[PDB]
Coordinates of N, CA and C and ligand atoms in Angstrom, one line a residue:
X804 N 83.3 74.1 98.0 CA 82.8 74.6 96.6 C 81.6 73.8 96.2
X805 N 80.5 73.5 96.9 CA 79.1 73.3 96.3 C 78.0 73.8 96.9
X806 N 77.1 74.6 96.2 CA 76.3 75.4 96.9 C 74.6 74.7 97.3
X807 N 74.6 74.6 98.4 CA 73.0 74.2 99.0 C 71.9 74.9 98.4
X808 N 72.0 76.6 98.6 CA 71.0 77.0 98.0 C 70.2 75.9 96.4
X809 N 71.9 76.4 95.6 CA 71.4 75.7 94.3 C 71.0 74.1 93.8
X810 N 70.0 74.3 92.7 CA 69.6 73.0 92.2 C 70.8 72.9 91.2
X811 N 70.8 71.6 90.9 CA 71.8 71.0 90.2 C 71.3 70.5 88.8
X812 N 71.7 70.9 87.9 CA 71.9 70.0 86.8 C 72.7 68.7 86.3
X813 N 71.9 67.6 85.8 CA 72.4 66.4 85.8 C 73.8 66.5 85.0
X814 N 74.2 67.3 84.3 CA 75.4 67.6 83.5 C 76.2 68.4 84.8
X815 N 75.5 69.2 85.9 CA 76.5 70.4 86.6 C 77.3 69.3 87.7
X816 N 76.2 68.7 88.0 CA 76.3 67.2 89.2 C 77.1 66.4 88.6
X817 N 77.6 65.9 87.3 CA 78.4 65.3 86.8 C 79.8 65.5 86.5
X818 N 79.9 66.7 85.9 CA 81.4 67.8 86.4 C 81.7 68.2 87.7
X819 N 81.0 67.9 88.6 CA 81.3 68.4 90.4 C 81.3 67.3 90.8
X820 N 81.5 66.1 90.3 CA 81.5 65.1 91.0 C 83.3 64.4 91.1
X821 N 83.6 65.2 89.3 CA 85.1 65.4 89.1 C 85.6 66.3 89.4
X822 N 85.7 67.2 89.3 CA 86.2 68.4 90.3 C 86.4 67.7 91.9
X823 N 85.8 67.1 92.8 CA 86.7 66.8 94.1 C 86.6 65.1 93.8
X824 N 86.4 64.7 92.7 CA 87.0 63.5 92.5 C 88.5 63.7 93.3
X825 N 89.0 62.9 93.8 CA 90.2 62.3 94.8 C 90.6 61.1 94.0
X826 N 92.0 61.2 93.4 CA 92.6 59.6 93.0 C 92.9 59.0 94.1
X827 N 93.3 58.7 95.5 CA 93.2 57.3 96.6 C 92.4 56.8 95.9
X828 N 90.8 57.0 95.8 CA 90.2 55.9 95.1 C 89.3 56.2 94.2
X829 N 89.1 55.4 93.2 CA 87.6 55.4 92.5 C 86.0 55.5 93.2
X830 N 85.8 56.6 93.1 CA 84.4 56.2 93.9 C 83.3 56.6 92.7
X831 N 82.6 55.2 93.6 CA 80.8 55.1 93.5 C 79.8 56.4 92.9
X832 N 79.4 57.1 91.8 CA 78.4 57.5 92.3 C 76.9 57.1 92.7
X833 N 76.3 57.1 93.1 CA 75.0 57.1 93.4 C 74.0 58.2 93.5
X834 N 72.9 57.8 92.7 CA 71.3 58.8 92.7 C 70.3 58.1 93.7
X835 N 70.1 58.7 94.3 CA 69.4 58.9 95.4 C 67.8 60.0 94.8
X836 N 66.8 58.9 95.5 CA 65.6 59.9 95.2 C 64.4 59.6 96.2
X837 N 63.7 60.9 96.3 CA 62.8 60.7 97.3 C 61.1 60.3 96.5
X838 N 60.8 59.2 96.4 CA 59.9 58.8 95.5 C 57.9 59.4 95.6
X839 N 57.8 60.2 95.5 CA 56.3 60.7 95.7 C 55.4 58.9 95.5
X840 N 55.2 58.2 96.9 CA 54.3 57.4 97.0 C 53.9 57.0 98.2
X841 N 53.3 56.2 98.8 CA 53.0 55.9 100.1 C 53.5 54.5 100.4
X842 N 54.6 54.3 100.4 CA 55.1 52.9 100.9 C 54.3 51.9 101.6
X843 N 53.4 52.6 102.6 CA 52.9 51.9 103.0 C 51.6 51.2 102.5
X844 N 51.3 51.3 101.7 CA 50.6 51.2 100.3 C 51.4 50.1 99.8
X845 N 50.6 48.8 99.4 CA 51.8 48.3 98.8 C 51.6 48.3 97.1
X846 N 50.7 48.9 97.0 CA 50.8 48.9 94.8 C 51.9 50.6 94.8
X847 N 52.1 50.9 95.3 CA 53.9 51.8 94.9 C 54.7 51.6 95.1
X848 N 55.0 50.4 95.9 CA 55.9 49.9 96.3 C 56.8 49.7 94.5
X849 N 58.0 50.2 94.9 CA 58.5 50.2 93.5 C 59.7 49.5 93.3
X850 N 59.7 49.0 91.9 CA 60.7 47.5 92.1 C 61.1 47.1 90.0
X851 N 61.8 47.3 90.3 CA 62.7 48.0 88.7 C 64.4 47.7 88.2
X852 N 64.3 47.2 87.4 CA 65.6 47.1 86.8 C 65.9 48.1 85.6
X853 N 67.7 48.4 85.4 CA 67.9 49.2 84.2 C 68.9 49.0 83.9
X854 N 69.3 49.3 82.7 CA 70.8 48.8 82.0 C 71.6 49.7 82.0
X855 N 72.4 50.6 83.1 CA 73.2 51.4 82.7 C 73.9 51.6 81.7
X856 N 73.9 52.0 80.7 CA 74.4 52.4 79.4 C 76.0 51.7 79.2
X857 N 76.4 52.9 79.8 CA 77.7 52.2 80.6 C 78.3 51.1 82.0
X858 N 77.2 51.1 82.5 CA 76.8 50.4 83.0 C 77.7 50.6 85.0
X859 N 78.6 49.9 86.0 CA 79.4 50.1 86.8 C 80.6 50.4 86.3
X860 N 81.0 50.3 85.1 CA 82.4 50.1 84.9 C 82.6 48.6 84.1
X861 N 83.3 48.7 83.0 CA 83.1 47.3 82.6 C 84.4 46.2 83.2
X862 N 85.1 46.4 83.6 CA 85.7 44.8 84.4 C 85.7 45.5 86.4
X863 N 84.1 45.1 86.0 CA 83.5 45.0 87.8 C 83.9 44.0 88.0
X864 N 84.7 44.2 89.2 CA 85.8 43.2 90.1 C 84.6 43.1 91.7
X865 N 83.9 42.0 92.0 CA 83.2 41.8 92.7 C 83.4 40.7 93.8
X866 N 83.3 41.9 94.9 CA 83.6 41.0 96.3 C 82.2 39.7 96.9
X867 N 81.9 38.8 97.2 CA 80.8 38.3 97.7 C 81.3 38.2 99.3
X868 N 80.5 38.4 100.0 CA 80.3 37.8 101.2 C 79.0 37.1 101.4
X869 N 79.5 35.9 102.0 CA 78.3 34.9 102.2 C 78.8 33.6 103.4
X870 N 78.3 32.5 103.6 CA 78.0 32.1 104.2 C 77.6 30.6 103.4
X871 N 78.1 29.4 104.3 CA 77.6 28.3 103.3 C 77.9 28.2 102.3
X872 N 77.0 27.5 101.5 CA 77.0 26.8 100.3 C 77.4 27.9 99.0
X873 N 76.6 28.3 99.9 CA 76.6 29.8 99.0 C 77.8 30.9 98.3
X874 N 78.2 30.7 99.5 CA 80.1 31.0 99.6 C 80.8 30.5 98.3
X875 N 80.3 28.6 98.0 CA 81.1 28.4 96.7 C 80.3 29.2 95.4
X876 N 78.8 28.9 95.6 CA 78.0 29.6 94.5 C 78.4 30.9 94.3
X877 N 79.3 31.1 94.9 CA 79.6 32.7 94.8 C 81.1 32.7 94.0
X878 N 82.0 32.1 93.9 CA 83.4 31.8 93.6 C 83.1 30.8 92.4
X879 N 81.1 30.1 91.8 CA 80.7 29.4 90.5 C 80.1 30.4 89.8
X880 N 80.2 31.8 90.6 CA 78.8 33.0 89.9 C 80.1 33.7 88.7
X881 N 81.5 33.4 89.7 CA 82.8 34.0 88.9 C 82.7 35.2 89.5
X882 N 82.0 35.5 90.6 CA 83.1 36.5 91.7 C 84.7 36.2 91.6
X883 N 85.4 37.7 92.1 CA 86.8 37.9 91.8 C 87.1 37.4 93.0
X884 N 86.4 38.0 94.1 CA 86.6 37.6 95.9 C 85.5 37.2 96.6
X885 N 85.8 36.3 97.0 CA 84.6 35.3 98.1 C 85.5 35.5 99.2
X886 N 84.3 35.1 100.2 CA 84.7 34.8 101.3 C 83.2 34.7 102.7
X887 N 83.9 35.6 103.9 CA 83.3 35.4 105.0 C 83.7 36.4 106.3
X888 N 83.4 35.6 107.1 CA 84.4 36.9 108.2 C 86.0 37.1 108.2
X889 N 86.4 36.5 107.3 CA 87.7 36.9 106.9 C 87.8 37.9 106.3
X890 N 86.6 37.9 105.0 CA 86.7 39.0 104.5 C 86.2 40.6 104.9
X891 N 85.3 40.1 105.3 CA 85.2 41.5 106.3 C 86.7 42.0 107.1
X892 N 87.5 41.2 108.1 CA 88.2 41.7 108.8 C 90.0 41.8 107.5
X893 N 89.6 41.4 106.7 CA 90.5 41.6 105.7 C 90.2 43.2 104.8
X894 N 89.0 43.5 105.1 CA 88.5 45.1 104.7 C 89.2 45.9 106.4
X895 N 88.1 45.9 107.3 CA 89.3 46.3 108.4 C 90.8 46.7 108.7
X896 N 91.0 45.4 108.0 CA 92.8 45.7 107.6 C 92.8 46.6 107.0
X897 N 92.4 47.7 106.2 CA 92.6 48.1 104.8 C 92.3 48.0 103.6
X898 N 92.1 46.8 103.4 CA 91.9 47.1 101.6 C 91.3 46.5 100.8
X899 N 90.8 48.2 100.5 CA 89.7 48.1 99.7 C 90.0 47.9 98.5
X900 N 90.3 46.4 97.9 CA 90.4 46.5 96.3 C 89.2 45.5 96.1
X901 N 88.4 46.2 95.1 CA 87.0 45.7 94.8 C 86.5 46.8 93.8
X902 N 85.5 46.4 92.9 CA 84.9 47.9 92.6 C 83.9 47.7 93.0
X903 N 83.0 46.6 93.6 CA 81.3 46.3 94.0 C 81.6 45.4 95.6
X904 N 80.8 45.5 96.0 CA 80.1 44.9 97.3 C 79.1 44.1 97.1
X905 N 78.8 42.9 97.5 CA 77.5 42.3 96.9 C 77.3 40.8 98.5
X906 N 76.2 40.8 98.6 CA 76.2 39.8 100.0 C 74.8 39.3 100.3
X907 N 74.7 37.9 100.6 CA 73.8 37.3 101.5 C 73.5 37.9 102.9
X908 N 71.4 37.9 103.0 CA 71.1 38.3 104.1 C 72.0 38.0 105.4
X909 N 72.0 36.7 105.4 CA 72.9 35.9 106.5 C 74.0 36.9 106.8
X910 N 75.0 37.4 106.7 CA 75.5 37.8 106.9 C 75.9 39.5 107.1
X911 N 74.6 40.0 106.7 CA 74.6 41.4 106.8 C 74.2 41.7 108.1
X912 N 74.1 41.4 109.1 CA 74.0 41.9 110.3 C 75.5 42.0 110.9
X913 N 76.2 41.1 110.6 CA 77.7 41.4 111.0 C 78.4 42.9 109.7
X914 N 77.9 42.6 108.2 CA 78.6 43.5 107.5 C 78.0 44.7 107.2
X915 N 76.6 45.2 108.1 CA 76.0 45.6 108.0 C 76.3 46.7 109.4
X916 N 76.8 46.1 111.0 CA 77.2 46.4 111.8 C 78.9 46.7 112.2
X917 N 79.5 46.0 111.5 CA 80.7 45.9 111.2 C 81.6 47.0 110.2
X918 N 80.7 46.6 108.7 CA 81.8 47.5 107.4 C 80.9 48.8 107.5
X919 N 79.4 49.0 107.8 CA 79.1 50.2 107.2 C 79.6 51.1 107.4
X920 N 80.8 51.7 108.7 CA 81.6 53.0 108.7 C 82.4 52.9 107.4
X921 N 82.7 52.0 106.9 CA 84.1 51.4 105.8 C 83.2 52.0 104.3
X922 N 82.6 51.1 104.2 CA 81.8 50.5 102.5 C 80.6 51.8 102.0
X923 N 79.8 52.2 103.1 CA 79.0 52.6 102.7 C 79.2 54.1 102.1
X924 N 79.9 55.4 102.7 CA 80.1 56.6 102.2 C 80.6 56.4 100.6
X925 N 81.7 55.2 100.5 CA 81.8 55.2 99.1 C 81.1 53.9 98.2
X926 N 79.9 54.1 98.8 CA 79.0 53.4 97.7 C 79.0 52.2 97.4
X927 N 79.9 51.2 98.2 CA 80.3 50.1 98.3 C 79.2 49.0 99.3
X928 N 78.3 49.9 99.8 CA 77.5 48.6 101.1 C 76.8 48.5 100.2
X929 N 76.6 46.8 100.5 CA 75.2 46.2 100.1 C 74.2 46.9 100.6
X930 N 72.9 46.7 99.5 CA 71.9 46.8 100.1 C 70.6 46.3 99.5
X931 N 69.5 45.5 100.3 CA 68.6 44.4 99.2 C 68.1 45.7 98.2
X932 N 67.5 46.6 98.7 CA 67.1 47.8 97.9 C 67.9 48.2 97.0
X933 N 69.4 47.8 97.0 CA 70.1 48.2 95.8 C 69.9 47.0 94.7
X934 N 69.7 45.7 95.3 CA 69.4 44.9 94.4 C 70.9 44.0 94.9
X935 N 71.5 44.3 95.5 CA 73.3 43.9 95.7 C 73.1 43.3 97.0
X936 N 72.1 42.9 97.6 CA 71.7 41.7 98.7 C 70.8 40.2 98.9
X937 N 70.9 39.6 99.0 CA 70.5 38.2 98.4 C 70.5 36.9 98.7
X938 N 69.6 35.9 98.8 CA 70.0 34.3 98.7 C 71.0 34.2 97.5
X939 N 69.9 35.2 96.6 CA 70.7 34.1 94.9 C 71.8 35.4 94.9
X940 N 72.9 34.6 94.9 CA 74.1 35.5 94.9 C 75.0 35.2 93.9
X941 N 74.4 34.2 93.0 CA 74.8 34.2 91.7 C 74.4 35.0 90.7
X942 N 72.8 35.7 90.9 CA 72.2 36.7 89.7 C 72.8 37.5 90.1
X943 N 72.8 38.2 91.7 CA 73.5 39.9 91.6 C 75.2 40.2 91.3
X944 N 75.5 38.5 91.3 CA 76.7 38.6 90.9 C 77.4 39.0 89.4
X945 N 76.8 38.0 88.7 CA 76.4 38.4 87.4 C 75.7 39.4 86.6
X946 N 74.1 40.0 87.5 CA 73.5 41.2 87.0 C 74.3 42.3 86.9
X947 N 75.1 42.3 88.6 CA 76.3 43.6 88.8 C 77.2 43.7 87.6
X948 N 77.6 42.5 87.2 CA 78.7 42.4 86.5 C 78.2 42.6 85.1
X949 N 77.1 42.3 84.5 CA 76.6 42.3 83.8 C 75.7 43.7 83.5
X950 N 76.3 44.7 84.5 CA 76.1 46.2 84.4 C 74.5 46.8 85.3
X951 N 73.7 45.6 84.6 CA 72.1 45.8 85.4 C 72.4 45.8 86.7
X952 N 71.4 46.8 87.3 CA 71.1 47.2 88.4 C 69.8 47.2 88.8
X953 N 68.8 46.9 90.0 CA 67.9 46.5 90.3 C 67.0 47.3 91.7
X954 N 66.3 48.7 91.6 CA 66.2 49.7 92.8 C 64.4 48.4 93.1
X955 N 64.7 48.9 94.5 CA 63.6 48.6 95.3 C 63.3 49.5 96.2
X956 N 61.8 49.2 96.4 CA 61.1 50.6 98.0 C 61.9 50.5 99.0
X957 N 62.4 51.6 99.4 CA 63.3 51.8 100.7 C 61.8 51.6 101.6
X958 N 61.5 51.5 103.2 CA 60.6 51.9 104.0 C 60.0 53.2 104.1
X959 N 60.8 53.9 103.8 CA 60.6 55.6 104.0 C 60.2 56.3 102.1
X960 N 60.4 55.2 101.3 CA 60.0 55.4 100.2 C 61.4 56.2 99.6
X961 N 62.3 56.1 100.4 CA 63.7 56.3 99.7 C 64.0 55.1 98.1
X962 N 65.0 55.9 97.2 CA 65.7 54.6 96.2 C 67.5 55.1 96.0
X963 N 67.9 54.5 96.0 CA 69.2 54.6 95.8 C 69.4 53.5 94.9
X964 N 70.5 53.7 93.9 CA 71.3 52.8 93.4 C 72.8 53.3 92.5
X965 N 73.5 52.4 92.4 CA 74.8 52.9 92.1 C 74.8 53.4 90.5
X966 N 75.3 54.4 90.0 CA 75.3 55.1 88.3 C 76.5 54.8 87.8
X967 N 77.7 54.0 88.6 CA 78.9 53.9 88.1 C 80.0 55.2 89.1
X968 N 81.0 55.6 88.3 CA 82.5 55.6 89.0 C 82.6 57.3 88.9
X969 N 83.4 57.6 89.2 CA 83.4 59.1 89.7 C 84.9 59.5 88.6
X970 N 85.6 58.2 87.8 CA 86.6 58.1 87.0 C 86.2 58.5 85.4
X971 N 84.7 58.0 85.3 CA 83.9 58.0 84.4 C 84.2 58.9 83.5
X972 N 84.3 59.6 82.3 CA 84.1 61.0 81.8 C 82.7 61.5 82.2
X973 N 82.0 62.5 82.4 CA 81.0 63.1 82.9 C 79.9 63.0 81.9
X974 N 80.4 62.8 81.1 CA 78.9 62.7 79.8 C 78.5 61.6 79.6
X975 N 79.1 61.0 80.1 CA 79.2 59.4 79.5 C 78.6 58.4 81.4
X976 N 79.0 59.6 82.0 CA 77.6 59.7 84.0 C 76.9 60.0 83.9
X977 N 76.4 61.1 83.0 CA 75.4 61.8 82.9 C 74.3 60.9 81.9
X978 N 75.1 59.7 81.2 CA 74.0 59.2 80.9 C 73.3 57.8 81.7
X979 N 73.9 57.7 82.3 CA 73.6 56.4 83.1 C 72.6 56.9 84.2
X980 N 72.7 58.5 84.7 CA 71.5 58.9 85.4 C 70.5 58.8 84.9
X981 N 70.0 59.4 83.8 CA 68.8 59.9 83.5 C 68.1 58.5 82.7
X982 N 69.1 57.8 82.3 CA 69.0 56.4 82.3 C 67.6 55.4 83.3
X983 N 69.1 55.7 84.2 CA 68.4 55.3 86.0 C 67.0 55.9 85.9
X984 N 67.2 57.2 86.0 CA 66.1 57.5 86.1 C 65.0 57.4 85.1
X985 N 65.1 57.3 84.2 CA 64.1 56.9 83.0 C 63.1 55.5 83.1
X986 N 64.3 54.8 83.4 CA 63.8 53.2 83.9 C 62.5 53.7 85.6
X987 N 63.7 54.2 86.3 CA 62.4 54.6 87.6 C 61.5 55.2 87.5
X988 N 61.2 55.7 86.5 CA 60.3 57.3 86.0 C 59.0 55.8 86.3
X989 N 59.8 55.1 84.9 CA 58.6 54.0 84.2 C 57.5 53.4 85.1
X990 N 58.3 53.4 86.3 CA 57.3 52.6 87.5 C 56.2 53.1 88.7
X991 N 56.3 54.2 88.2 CA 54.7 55.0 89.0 C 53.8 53.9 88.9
X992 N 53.0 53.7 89.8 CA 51.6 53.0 89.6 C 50.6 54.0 89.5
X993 N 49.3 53.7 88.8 CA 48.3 54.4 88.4 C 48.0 55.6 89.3
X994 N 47.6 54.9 90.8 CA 46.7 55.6 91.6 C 47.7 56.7 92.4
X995 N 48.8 57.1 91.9 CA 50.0 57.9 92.5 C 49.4 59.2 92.8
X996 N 49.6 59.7 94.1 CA 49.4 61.7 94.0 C 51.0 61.9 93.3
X997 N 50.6 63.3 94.1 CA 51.6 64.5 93.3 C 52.9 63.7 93.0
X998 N 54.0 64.5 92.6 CA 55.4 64.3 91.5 C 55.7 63.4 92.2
X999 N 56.2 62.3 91.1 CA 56.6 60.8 91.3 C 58.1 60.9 92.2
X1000 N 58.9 62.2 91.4 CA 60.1 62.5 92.1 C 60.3 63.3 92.8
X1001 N 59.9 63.1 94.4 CA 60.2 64.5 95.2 C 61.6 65.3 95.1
X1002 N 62.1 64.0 95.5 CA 63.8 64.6 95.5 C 64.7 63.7 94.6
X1003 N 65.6 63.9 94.2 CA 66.8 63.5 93.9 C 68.1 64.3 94.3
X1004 N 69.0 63.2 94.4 CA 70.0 64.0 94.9 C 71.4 62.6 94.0
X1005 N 72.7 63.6 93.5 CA 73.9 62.6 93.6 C 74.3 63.0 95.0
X1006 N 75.6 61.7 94.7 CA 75.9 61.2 96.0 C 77.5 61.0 95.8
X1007 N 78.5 60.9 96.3 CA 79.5 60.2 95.8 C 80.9 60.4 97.9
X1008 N 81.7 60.1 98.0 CA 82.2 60.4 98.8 C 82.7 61.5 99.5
X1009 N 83.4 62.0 98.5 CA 83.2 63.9 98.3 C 82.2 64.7 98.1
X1010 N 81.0 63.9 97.9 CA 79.9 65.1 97.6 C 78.9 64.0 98.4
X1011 N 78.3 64.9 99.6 CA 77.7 63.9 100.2 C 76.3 64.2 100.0
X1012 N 75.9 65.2 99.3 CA 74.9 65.0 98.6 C 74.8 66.4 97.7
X1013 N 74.3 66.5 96.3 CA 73.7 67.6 95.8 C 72.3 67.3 95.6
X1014 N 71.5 68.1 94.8 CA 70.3 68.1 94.6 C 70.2 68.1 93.4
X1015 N 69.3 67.0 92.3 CA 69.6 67.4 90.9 C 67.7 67.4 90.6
X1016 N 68.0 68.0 89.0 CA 67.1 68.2 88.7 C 66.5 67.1 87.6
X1017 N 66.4 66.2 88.0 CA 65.9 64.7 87.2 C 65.9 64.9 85.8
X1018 N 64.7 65.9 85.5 CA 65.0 66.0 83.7 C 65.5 67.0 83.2
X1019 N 66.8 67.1 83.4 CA 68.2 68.0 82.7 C 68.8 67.3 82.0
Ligands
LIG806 CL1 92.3 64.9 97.2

């Protein structure tokens, strides 16, 4: 029950996101957009923070994985769960109680090789482009928690970042997109060609992708 042909409204994408919402778990959504710039350019390279209204969810329960020192700065940042390769194979095990993912470079070649079958469909993998990968794993610990979210240039000139929970009421998601996207609108650079937003699309576990229409 979601149709390809059609474009999506940021209100239609928001009620279809509950509609195959599934209670096993809370999921992630995520907006996804294909950015009109030339990455390889680096004045488009685009790099932006925004306050989700509502932000992830307000008691974001945040996992760190890290490595070193960093490991304790992560359990001083007032992460709920630290850890290591324990933690990873303690995901393995099963379970996923967390509402955020958040991790040092160091270690994302294992959780990056490792969880992404696990973390990533529901919106849970780190990613430095999401802003939720890091030395300082004290700011994303706190920014996450602290609702802000932080998109950067994918290579391909992709952006993704998380809009909150799929638990959400729909009006109250629907404002955290255009949100999102309001803040990303902001960061065109001058010398940009055509539409800053080629694509957008939500995202969530059940909906592996619609197409929306940015300013609905
Ligand atoms: Cl179900």
């Amino acid at each position: 029950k979601v149709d390809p042909n059609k474009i999506y409204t940021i209100d239609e994408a928001a009620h279809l996101v509950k509609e195959l919402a599934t209670a096993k778990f809370d999921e992630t959504v995520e907006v996804h957009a294909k950015l009109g710039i030339d990455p390889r350019r680096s004045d488009q390279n685009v790099r932006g923070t925004v306050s989700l209204p509502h932000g992830l969810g307000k008691q974001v329960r945040v996992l760190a994985i890290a490595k070193g020192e960093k490991i304790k700065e992560a359990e001083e940042a007032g992460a709920d769960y630290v850890g290591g390769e324990e933690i990873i194979q303690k995901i393995l095990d099963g379970w996923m109680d967390f509402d955020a993912v958040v991790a040092t470079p160091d270690v994302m070649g294992a959780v990056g090789s490792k969880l992404g079958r696990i973390l990533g469909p529901r919106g849970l993998l780190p990613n430095p482009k999401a802003g939720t990968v890091g030395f300082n794993i004290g700011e994303i610990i706190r920014e996450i928690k602290a609702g802000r979210i932080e998109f950067r240039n994918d290579k391909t000139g992709a952006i993704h970042a998380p809009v909150g929970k799929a638990s959400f009421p729909p009006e109250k998601l629907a404002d955290n997109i255009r949100a999102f996207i309001r803040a990303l609108e902001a960061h065109k650079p001058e010398g940009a060609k055509g539409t800053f937003l080629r694509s957008v699309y939500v995202t969530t576990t059940m909906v592996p992708s619609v197409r929306i229409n940015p300013h609905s």
